[PDB]
Amino acid sequence: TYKFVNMREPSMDMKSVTDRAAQTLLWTELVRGLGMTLSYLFREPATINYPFEKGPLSPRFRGEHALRRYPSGEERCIACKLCEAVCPAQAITIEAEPRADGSRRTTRYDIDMTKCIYCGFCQEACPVDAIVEGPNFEFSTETHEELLYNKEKLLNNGDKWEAEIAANIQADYLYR
Amino acid sequence: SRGEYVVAKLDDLVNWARRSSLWPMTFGLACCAVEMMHMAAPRYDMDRFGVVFRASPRQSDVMIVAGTLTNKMAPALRKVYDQMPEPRYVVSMGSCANGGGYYHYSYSVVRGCDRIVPVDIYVPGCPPTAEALLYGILQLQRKIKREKRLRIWYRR
Amino acid sequence: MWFEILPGIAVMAACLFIPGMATAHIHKFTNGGKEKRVAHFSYQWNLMERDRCISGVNRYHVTKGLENID
Amino acid sequence: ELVQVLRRGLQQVSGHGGLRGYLRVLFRANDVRVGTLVGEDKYGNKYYEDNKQFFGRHRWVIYTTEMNGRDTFWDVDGSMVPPEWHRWLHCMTDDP
Amino acid sequence: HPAAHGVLRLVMELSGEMVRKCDPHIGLLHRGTEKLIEYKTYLQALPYFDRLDYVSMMCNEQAYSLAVEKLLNIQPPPRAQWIRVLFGEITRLLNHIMAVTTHALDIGAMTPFFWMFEEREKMFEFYERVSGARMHAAYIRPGGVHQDLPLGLLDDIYEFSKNFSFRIDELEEMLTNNRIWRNRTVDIGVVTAEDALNYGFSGVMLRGSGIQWDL
Amino acid sequence: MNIMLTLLTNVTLASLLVLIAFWLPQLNAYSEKTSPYECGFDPMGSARLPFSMKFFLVAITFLLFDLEIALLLPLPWASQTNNLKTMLTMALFLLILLAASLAYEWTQKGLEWAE
Amino acid sequence: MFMINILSLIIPILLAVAFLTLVERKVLGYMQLRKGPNVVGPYGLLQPIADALKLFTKEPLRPATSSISMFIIAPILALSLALTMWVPLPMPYPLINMNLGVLFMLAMSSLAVYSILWSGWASNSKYALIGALRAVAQTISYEVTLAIILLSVLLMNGSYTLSTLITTQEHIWMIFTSWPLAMMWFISTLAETNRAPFDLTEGESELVSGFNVEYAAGPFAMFFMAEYANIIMMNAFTAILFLGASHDPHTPELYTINFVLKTLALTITFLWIRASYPRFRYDQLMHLLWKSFLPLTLALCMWHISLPIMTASIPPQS
Numbered sequence A: 001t002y003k004f005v006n007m008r009e010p011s012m013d014m015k016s017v018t019d020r021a022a023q024t025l026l027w028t029e030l031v032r033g034l035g036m037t038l039s040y041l042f043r044e045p046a047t048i049n050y051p052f053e054k055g056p057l058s059p060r061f062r063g064e065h066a067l068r069r070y071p072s073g074e075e076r077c078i079a080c081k082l083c084e085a086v087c088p089a090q091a092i093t094i095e096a097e098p099r100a101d102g103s104r105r106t107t108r109y110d111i112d113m114t115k116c117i118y119c120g121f122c123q124e125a126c127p128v129d130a131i132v133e134g135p136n137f138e139f140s141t142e143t144h145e146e147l148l149y150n151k152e153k154l155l156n157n158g159d160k161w162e163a164e165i166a167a168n169i170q171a172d173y174l175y176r
Numbered sequence B: 001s002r003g004e005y006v007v008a009k010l011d012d013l014v015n016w017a018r019r020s021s022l023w024p025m026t027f028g029l030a031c032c033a034v035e036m037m038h039m040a041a042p043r044y045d046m047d048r049f050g051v052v053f054r055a056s057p058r059q060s061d062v063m064i065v066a067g068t069l070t071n072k073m074a075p076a077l078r079k080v081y082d083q084m085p086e087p088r089y090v091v092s093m094g095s096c097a098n099g100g101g102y103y104h105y106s107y108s109v110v111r112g113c114d115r116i117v118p119v120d121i122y123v124p125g126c127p128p129t130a131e132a133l134l135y136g137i138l139q140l141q142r143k144i145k146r147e148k149r150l151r152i153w154y155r156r
Numbered sequence C: 001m002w003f004e005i006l007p008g009i010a011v012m013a014a015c016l017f018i019p020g021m022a023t024a025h026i027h028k029f030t031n032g033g034k035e036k037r038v039a040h041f042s043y044q045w046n047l048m049e050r051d052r053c054i055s056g057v058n059r060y061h062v063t064k065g066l067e068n069i070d
Numbered sequence D: 001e002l003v004q005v006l007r008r009g010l011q012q013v014s015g016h017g018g019l020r021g022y023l024r025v026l027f028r029a030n031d032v033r034v035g036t037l038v039g040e041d042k043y044g045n046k047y048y049e050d051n052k053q054f055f056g057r058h059r060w061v062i063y064t065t066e067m068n069g070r071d072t073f074w075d076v077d078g079s080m081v082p083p084e085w086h087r088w089l090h091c092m093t094d095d096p
Numbered sequence E: 001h002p003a004a005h006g007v008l009r010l011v012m013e014l015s016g017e018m019v020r021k022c023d024p025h026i027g028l029l030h031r032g033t034e035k036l037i038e039y040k041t042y043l044q045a046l047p048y049f050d051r052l053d054y055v056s057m058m059c060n061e062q063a064y065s066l067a068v069e070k071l072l073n074i075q076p077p078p079r080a081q082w083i084r085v086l087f088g089e090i091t092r093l094l095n096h097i098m099a100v101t102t103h104a105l106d107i108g109a110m111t112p113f114f115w116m117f118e119e120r121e122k123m124f125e126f127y128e129r130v131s132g133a134r135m136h137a138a139y140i141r142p143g144g145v146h147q148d149l150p151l152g153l154l155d156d157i158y159e160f161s162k163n164f165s166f167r168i169d170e171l172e173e174m175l176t177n178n179r180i181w182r183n184r185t186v187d188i189g190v191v192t193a194e195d196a197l198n199y200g201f202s203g204v205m206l207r208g209s210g211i212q213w214d215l
Numbered sequence F: 001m002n003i004m005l006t007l008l009t010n011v012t013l014a015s016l017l018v019l020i021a022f023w024l025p026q027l028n029a030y031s032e033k034t035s036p037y038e039c040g041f042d043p044m045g046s047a048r049l050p051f052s053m054k055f056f057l058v059a060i061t062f063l064l065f066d067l068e069i070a071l072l073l074p075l076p077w078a079s080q081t082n083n084l085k086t087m088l089t090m091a092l093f094l095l096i097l098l099a100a101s102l103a104y105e106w107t108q109k110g111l112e113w114a115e
Numbered sequence G: 001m002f003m004i005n006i007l008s009l010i011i012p013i014l015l016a017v018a019f020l021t022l023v024e025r026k027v028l029g030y031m032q033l034r035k036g037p038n039v040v041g042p043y044g045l046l047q048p049i050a051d052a053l054k055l056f057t058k059e060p061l062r063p064a065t066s067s068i069s070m071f072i073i074a075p076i077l078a079l080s081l082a083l084t085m086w087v088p089l090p091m092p093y094p095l096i097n098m099n100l101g102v103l104f105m106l107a108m109s110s111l112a113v114y115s116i117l118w119s120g121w122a123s124n125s126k127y128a129l130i131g132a133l134r135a136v137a138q139t140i141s142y143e144v145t146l147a148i149i150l151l152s153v154l155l156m157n158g159s160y161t162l163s164t165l166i167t168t169q170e171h172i173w174m175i176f177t178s179w180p181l182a183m184m185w186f187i188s189t190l191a192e193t194n195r196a197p198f199d200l201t202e203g204e205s206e207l208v209s210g211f212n213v214e215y216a217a218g219p220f221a222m223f224f225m226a227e228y229a230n231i232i233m234m235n236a237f238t239a240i241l242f243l244g245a246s247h248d249p250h251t252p253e254l255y256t257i258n259f260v261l262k263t264l265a266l267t268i269t270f271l272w273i274r275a276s277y278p279r280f281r282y283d284q285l286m287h288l289l290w291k292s293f294l295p296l297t298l299a300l301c302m303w304h305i306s307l308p309i310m311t312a313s314i315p316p317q318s
């Protein structure tokens, strides 16, 4: 079905003609717009008092990246390169070798945060919940190089944000 | 010293005015400019802080490079940056402006607006949220707070 | 809230008070406590000049009266 | 009534610990609302809640005047909140 | 330019202020999306569509997913289809808010821009709740949707939808019957139905010209 | 005298503001900064070329109507005369002729802009 | 003491201009559901000071294609005339008491026209030229309509003296007497001051800052100050002309308070209109006054010529 947005004609009776003439000579719709703006003036603003008040977020939010650990302290990442394979922007560089104790662990785990599109594919493809996107989003820097994270930086992010990351994963893991 | 105290107070006053009155040029390139509009929106009102969009580059203090910078667009961005009078600052926003972004390995995309203009602040994200951009703006303000031009000149 | 606009309006109103009140006080100060004489016409100007002449101090606002005629 | 609003304003003045505290919270937070203190972290930041405010203004933080080794009396960042209070303040959970 | 949307070079020949010809120079935001898609996989190319029309993002994702599923000869579940349509209409609300308010801002009115952009902020909250990203969700994928809705999303969407018609009415109170807006918009850019069809217009352009067509 | 002093004060204040504007701040000018602004791209032509004026007839009519308002201005004093009937007739005559000029131009399409 | 009076007229006007900038910011924000400046100072009271310091410490540049002499003169002329327009206003006592106080304001407004024209021509750019010619057309229309409207309203007064306006409005208001002329005068003052919906000389959406596209730093601030001073002065003129305040010779401060309140109400109405309405096209603005206001203005001028004669209510000559 369909409807006509504008196909109505005005009645030509004397009362309606006089009403339209009063609207033309006395700016009735303009006064109506003024009244609407005045109402909005006397309403309460929708502004939050940042940085003392923060906009709402969800457990699924994709912010800064982090490399997680098992509760024993062992790194979760097993150098499987699924995140590197699935990364759309090719932001992840991974190099690995057998460790001293024979573990399959990474030696280089770089993420170019100026190349990443924050799409969350890396944490979807991780089978051990190693790489995650944390809740942090206020990590702007003054130089370009500071946004080229490496394995040490990502492990520091994980250690710094482990509690909130764990809480969010606990909250949202049953939907995955 | 008396002169040192005078110049310190004077360039505290000067940095306060520039920090508190920021006029971004009305300049957006791609999806990152929508978050600029949402930062201008009532929720994160940028006009509270003294941050006001001005259309003319002559009446602009900050260039927010929000979007992908292409080979066909780089000359215009450089031109408007040059036509901006000093002191002037640059805030790159989003992955495309920071480095290459989703289009890093492209024939028609500049891998970083810092290849074109000197960038003062980098805001990460795709797109960075309006709160992230506001944090970047406040970080730029704090960076301005530390400038000591009269103090450098006095000891020069 | 909308009443946070008032302090700026209050400052603007206080600024706009200064010109008129200052002009009135200066007029009363320089005319011996009276309104500044309005002379839109030659008759009023000649009245002012005659007031200057008869005052004896070269000030039209110095008014004399019956004690001066006798 | 305007009298009730003025009395609430006076209560806000007295609710921050006198006129000096009112001016301190006005000049370093641009807000003088009074809310129930949810808690305080190890760095000095105080967290307040007021469920009567609309969503987005019902939780807020008054930052400390000194964190680590930086004087943050005026220079307050959004990154000065530890992750747990960050989650509570950004409303990823209802539990402080 | 404020009215050029950022990356449009409109070379215009003007006799005084009357327009003699418009020569839109485009490509200042050309990135090579199709070549990059050739180099990506089907799952890796979805965010490209997320970033094509960055005001109707889940709509672009839905179109791409429909194409890929048609090629694959598979079928999304009914709940996935219903979520797709629901968020497609939410995205349509976002896009139309942006379009109308930016149009009115180019004409000279900004208050509706601010109001309807607060509404856009609420819809961005919905997007972030389902996907974790405020606008570039990458939520609708070939085969269905990535994740299920949280356990309050439907109620919050119901509240938003309940309180939105008043916002539309307030938007109409400033523009619809305003004589300045009518002078600016009425009998401007008139296009006949045959010309629209031949030039290849689609959607609101056709329907404004009067063509009864909706996909 | 007083008006001259006021004008001198205002002009001196404005000139002092300009002088402070052009000497107080640090200056750094080069060719790219001082080039004309055309939204990021070099202008094709020059701004000194002819710029067609589509309301050229309305400007001439404005000159004539400015004459009309100059004629009409001394009316407040003219209403203090004893020949009120003659004064009223002449004032209405001038205003009716002005209205006739406006109506003639409107009907002959002199108020429409050139295409 | 006359120099002291000049300073007492000038400096508060500039301070009120700065705080009017702040007030417009906050009023537009609250009408747009925002808050406006409330961070720089308490309730954002130091925002004008910060903006002035930034503008006058920023680098000004003269374009390579510009005519430097007229590029510099234009802001000087704009600010000088904006400050000069205030000297005949009685609040309740004028600084300079003129016998023809209104024709002086008309002439000074027509001279203040040329600031934007010469700044647009001197800038030597296409957007500046377009803004200058938009100013030309706008001045044409508003000038003719304003002249005739003022003629009629003052014909209800008896002379061109604003103190005589006060004496006329001792009992009732010229808004009660002649409200249609008041409506058309308000629209014409909007057009004269280049306010929305008639902000066409500097139209951001269509032109990139219009006539002052090349102006920056201090010279730009002078144009802004001139515009806001003209806004306040025209609203004060409207208040004196149509909303007459009761005057007590022995306590004149009451007139000052009433006049300031009325002027503030009119200026806030200006800001309200800017927040409310879209922008005109300048051909539609020319057709608005010439084809709608001008016929009604002529008819009302004839009516206000006839009315004192037919009702034996001609005002005194002096």
Ligand SMILES: COC1=C(OC)C(=O)C(C/C=C(\C)CC/C=C(/C)CC/C=C(\C)CC/C=C(/C)CC/C=C(\C)CC/C=C(\C)CC/C=C(/C)CC/C=C(/C)CC/C=C(\C)CCC=C(C)C)=C(C)C1=O
Binding pocket: B025, B026, B027, B028, B029, B033, B036, B037, B040, B041, B047, B052, B053, E001, E002, E003, E004, E005, E006, E102, E105, E110, G011, G014, G015, G017, G018, G021, G024, G025, G028, G048, G049, G051, G052, G055, G221, G224, G225
């Ligand atoms: C191109 O793609 C696009 C974008 O981009 C990517 C976009 O974003 C958007 C989105 C668009 C929007 C979001 C809309 C824009 C956003 C808005 C918020 C619009 C709102 C606009 C405003 C609120 C207007 C504000 C603009 C300005 C310029 C205000 C700035 C203020 C000034 C310039 C005033 C400065 C001048 C001053 C203060 C004058 C005072 C100076 C003086 C010297 C006066 C003092 C003089 C004296 C003599 C005083 C001295 C006296 C003394 C010392 C003694 C006094 C006594 C005492 C006791 C003190 C769109 C659509 C888009 O399509």
Ligand SMILES: CCCCCCCCCCCCCCCCCC(=O)OC[C@H](COP(=O)([O-])OCC[N+](C)(C)C)OC(=O)CCCCCCCCCCCCCCCCC
Binding pocket: F016, F019, F020, F023, F024, F025, F026, F027
């Ligand atoms: C034309 C106007 C005349 C009346 C002026 C009335 C007073 C004006 C008040 C407003 C001043 C505005 C500027 C405020 C201060 C900031 C800028 C500043 O300091 O500028 C000064 C300028 C500064 O030079 P600048 O070009 O480097 O200015 C840039 C300044 N900074 C770095 C702060 C941005 O000083 C000079 O130009 C001269 C410096 C010393 C060299 C002297 C050379 C000889 C000529 C002058 C001395 C006297 C000679 C006597 C003998 C002559 C015969 C041989």
Ligand SMILES: CCCCCCCCCCCCCCCCC[C@@H](O)O[C@H](CO[C@H](O)CCCCCCCCCCCCCCC)COP(=O)(O)OCC[N+](C)(C)C
Binding pocket: B009, B010, B012, B013, B016, D027, D028, D029, D030, D074, D075, D076, G039, G046, G048, G049, G052, G053
């Ligand atoms: C208008 C006409 C021209 C005026 C000419 C000057 C007139 C006087 C200028 C007025 C000075 C205003 C100073 C304002 C002080 C800032 C208030 C305070 O908050 O600033 C703090 C201190 O500021 C700086 O330390 C220095 C400020 C300026 C110090 C005064 C210098 C001397 C001024 C007095 C001399 C004036 C005469 C000499 C010049 C003519 C740091 O705050 P900040 O971190 O940012 O705020 C962040 C926002 N938060 C709080 C929400 C997070």
Ligand SMILES: CCCCCCCC/C=C/CCCCCCCC(=O)OC[C@H](COP(=O)(O)OCCN)OC(=O)CCCCCCC/C=C/CCCCCCCC
Binding pocket: A024, A025, A026, A027, A030, E179, G175, G180, G181, G182, G183, G184, G186, G187, G197, G238, G242, G273, G277, G292, G293, G296, G303
């Ligand atoms: C002094 C303070 C005054 C305050 C008044 C403020 C009013 C509200 C302000 C908001 C408006 C500001 C922005 C609006 C700008 C545009 C205004 C506008 O459009 O009005 C003009 C409007 C638009 O015309 P169109 O729609 O284009 O129709 C054209 C047909 N071909 O038309 C007008 O000209 C209206 C003119 C109003 C004059 C008043 C009408 C006169 C009434 C007649 C009765 C009086 C007869 C007197 C004789 C009495 C005998 C006893």
Ligand SMILES: CCCCCCCCCCCCCCCCCC(=O)OC[C@H](COP(=O)(O)OCCN)OC(=O)CCCCCCCCCCCCCCCCC
Binding pocket: B010, B014, B149, B150, B152, B153, B156, F020, F024, F025, F026, G052, G053, G056, G057
């Ligand atoms: C009670 C008695 C009075 C008490 C107060 C007395 C002082 C009041 C202020 C007087 C005016 C300012 C005087 C000069 C200030 C110092 C300027 C200076 O020396 O600047 C030098 C320097 C230039 O750069 P430099 O380091 O030399 O390096 C070369 C660049 N490649 O660095 C710069 O140029 C920095 C850029 C800014 C310089 C200009 C601004 C200086 C501060 C002005 C404050 C007041 C502003 C008023 C504005 C007008 C009114 C609104």
Ligand SMILES: CN(C)C(=N)NC(=N)N
Binding pocket: B028, B030, B033, E002, E004, E005, E006, E055, E102
């Ligand atoms: C990016 N889009 C869609 C815009 N409309 N942009 C704009 N600057 N007006």
Ligand code: SF4
Binding pocket: A083, A086, A087, A088, A089, A090, A091, A092, A111, A115, A116, A117, A118, A119, A120, A121, A122, A123
């Ligand atoms: S979020 Fe996406 S673009 Fe970023 S590193 Fe992970 S897979 Fe790559």
Ligand code: SF4
Binding pocket: A076, A077, A078, A079, A080, A081, A082, A083, A084, A094, A122, A125, A126, A127, A128, A129, A130, A131
């Ligand atoms: S998907 Fe996980 S385990 Fe595999 S390489 Fe990436 S971070 Fe390591």
Ligand code: SF4
Binding pocket: A117, B030, B031, B032, B066, B067, B068, B093, B094, B095, B096, B097, B101, B102, B125, B126, B127, B128, E051, E136
């Ligand atoms: S960084 Fe992401 S959101 Fe920003 S312009 Fe690039 S693709 Fe768009």
